[PDB]
Design a protein around this ligand. Structure first.
Ligand SMILES: [Zn+2]
Length: 85
């Protein structure tokens, strides 16, 4: 058959994702950091919203919960999980 080989493999540049910035992608319109997560403790209910399509969602949260989790939930809640309240 065929073959050559060479080797050598430099390390990839450092690039991580800084979560917990009250910002997340919107699966509805998808316009990058364009959403705000409202963590209401008194009511223990996190409400998310968009800044392009004008959307909003509500979900039960707690002190331990994070502003990054609510985002994920909103996804499954839309693709399959109609919340009532
Ligand atoms: Zn949107």
């Amino acid at each position: 058959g065929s073959s050559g080989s060479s080797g050598r493999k430099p390390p990839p540049k450092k690039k991580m994702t800084g979560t917990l910035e009250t910002q997340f992608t919107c699966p509805f319109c998808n316009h990058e950091k364009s959403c705000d997560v409202k963590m209401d403790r008194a009511r223990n209910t996190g409400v998310i919203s968009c800044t392009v399509c004008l959307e909003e969602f509500q979900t039960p949260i707690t002190y331990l919960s994070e502003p990054v989790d609510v985002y994920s939930d909103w996804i499954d809640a839309c693709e399959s999980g109609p919340s009532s309240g």
